[PDB]
């Protein structure tokens, strides 16, 4: 049971939009929408969307080990060795928003802070003493970007695993050398860091050049979450607002992965008419290099739909029915909605592109999807007297519930936490998400102008 | 009754160490050690001082006025006209941590994400519907540090002043023409941003080459809140750990200002001898070019203590008894003192450089002095019932309260909030300090290994 299972379980289920059905459906953590901070949805003018992991939830295991796979193949082809053929995606290992460390080839969990959580050396969990070795502080510096590596997304989980895989492998080869920086074959050194880099690359690679795409879309049954309750939220938004898309993507996939998503005998509710997706948004916007997007931008350009290709020069004209856009920056999505970033709902995946660059950077209101919660509340949950047990205990106690706490949600542990302690994570989905929740949808069991509410916040001499 | 009047008292007050007496000392608010993150003293080996508005903090309103009169006296003699010479500091107008935009010359109070909670042009307030005309989204980019500069420290009070007392003078006056972005003068123009930088600078001068240390060293008492205790809580921290001194000040100025601080006829209690400031310190820095001290430094040196002199050349010695130290680096302590950074506990009143950077940088525990806080909680006690009502209501009734609960605290309102939304500063107290109160000599009223406590933060969903 993936956090994709339960997904697309409520996905099947028909919207029942009795407005005492809806108040009863999010009273189970599911289907609620968490709230960081107050929001009067009264005040919400456009609402917008990213695709890939917001509308477009991609199917667990399945994808990860896909783009395991082509990655695995990538590296295979430019010179790895075919031992690489026998690694197999292992759903278990890798929790979402790790640190590659490509100094000394760690994967770290840490808070905040920068502090120590979790240490793997390939699948080696280094125990507090021995980290004290590459970490005397135990602490990494969150600011040197260039030395550690956030996997902020689902997307990052198949390199993730794969770091890893790499690390073990080369470890336990007899045809290398392992340093304190990487590892000796020979008369060749591949530093972490490097190693790291052609994954990346590689990552790259089968995004750009390879062939996740077209094997996605030639089996998106396998691979995408569908649900009939999207038309209806999307419409319902349209009713009182302006509604956008902002993709990373390009004009071609986004057009296939959403046919897919609104391919259904109907319209909005079923004995509608069906309609094109576009139909649903008031301004559509691809190639949006975000984060890029929140700052200068680039320079805004035309689709050609017919061909899937930029129009040639600068897109100088006003919003049209029917005109796509490619690049640009926020400030085009405010200019051409009439819009402010308070007036903005902005729904998104990624912790770093979509949520904390939308906040800082203009202020928009912002909603974090996080598709693992559908699973990690369910653990959660069923295991709360293990949470329980550690916050009354707060030594080799704790120590152990800790430990036998984090294993039931993977080899890495929660999303959220590590025992007591909160993860980077967590903090920054408290710190940049005023709304966040397992999917969108949840907004449907809300009414038009609800007040999502949170608690003032007093310092420790204000109680 | 100035915030430094409640510190003077409290140091005019012999130290009663009976355990009892401790205890209830510590119950008040004053006396406080406030707690972000659970600390557990025992842990900490190294106590390290900043000395300016720390160690040393300085009479109010005596030191901003007289800093306030000497920046206007600077301004005046590079060109600036003579109704300069007729401003007097107001106390009662700036408050710490406001933010003073270039481009058009607004002093903002603003919170954690750039939204705006007060706007002032001059004097004048500028209310909510107006300010819409510049800020838009009623919202800055912080990550605009070129445009936007924070006055975190109580050393910026005169600036705060000043940079209100300019824009008001100019803009009444009727021999200039006001702009968007500044002031024309004829066929001179100067712009609210090269005005601001005319103020940094003339700050700087007073500071670096003017008469503010001569002023303040030929009347400390006036000057300079002195205190019994501190060479009793100094001696105690030696007792169980070692202690050093970080001052972005020089020598010469330290050792008049500290030799100052432990001038009494006694050293650590009454009865003993009086021993030499730097008998307290197993190392002593100076010149420590704080936040660049908490990333790559600058190189280390030697003062001569004999002519306040550095010594020409790389330090590359040992740590030895009597050396002062010159610039270097937070690594400087760590080595020098065997000391990792969650040993160490940095006590500083620099939000941004002393605190914010330590932490982020190095992961030092951290304590922040907030001199103000004396004050502060005196209103938050007896005016409490303000809060309340507003706490209670949560429209128009709101912005009276609001209004009326920020007045007492004085025209720019509590450094921490405005009605019921919280500042940057108090965020980011929040965030970075792990510890906090009125005076590091609150750390005396608790015993040798005390655990500060702060309850675990739970997530929405986990709640
Ligand atoms: N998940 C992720 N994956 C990959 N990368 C990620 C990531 N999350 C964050 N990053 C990036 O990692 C780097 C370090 O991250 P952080 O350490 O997170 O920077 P921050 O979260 O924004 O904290 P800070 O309180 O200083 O920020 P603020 O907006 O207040 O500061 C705004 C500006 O004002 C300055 N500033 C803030 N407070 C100040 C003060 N009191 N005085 C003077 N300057 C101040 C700051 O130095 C800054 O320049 C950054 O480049 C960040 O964008
Ligand atoms: N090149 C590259 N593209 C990525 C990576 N991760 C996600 N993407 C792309 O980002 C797009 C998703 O954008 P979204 O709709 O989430 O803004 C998809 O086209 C996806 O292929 C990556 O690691 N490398
Ligand atoms: N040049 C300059 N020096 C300052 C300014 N504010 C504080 N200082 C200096 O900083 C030193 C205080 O450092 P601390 O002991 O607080 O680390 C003092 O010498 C003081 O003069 C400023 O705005 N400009
Ligand atoms: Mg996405
Ligand atoms: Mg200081």
Redesign the interface.
């Known amino acids: 049971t993936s956090w994709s299972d339960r997904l697309q379980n409520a996905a099947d289920m028909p919207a029942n939009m009795d407005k005492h059905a809806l108040k009863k459906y999010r009273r189970e953590?599911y289907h609620?929408v968490?709230?960081?901070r107050s929001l009067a949805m009264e005040k919400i003018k456009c609402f917008g969307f990213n695709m890939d992991y917001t509308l477009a939830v991609y199917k667990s295991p399945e994808y990860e080990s896909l783009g395991f796979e082509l990655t695995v193949e990538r590296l295979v082809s430019i010179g790895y060795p075919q031992e690489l053929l026998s690694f197999a995606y292992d759903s278990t290992f890798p929790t979402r928003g790790l640190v590659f460390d490509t100094l000394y080839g760690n994967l770290l969990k840490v808070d905040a802070?920068?502090?120590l959580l979790v240490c793997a050396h390939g699948f080696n969990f280094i125990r507090g003493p021995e980290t004290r070795e590459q970490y005397?502080?135990?602490?990494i510096?969150?600011?040197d970007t260039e030395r550690f590596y956030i996997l902020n997304t689902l997307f990052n989980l198949p390199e993730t695993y794969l770091l890893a895989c790499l690390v073990d492998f080369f470890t336990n080869c007899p045809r290398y050398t392992s340093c304190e920086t990487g590892f000796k074959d020979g008369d060749l050194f591949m530093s972490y860091r490097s190693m790291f880099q052609d994954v990346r690359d590689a990552v790259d690679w089968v995004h750009y050049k390879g062939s996740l795409k077209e094997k996605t879309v030639e089996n998106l049954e396998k691979y995408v979450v569908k649900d009939g309750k999207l038309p209806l939220l999307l419409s319902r938004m349209k009713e009182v607002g302006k509604v956008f898309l902002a993709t990373n993507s390009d004009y071609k996939y986004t057009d296939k992965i959403m046919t897919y998503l609104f391919d259904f005998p109907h319209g909005p509710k079923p004995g509608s008419s069906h309609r094109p997706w576009q139909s649903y948004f008031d301004l559509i916007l691809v190639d949006a290099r975000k984060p890029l997007f929140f700052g200068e931008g680039t320079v805004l350009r035309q689709v050609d739909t017919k061909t899937g290709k930029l129009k040639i020069g600068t897109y100088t004209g006003p919003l049209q029915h029917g005109i796509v856009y490619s690049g640009g920056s926020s400030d085009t999505i405010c200019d051409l909605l009439g819009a402010?970033?308070?007036d903005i709902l902005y729904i998104g995946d990624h912790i770093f592109g979509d949520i904390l660059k939308s906040?800082?950077?203009?202020?928009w209101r912002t909603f974090l999807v996080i598709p693992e919660?559908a699973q990690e509340?369910h653990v959660?949950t069923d295991k709360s007297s293990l949470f329980e047990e550690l916050?009354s205990l707060?030594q080799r106690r704790i120590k152990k519930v800790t430990h036998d706490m984090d294993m039931c949600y993977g080899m890495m542990g929660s999303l959220?936490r590590s025992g007591?302690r909160?993860t980077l994570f967590?903090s920054q989905?408290?710190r940049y998400a005023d709304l966040?929740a397992a999917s969108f949808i949840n907004l449907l069991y809300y009414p038009f102008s609800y007040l999502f509410r949170?608690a003032?916040?007093l310092?420790?001499?204000?109680s």
């Not at 005397?136 to 602490?139: A, G, Q």
């Not at 906040?359 to 202020?363: A, E, S, T, V």
């Not at 310092?459 to 204000?462: A, G, I, K, L, Q």
């Open positions: 953590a609620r968490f709230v960081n802070y920068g502090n005397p502080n135990k602490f510096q969150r600011d402010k970033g308070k906040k800082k950077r203009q202020g919660l509340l959660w916050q707060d959220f007591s909160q967590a989905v408290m966040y949170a003032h916040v310092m420790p001499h204000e």
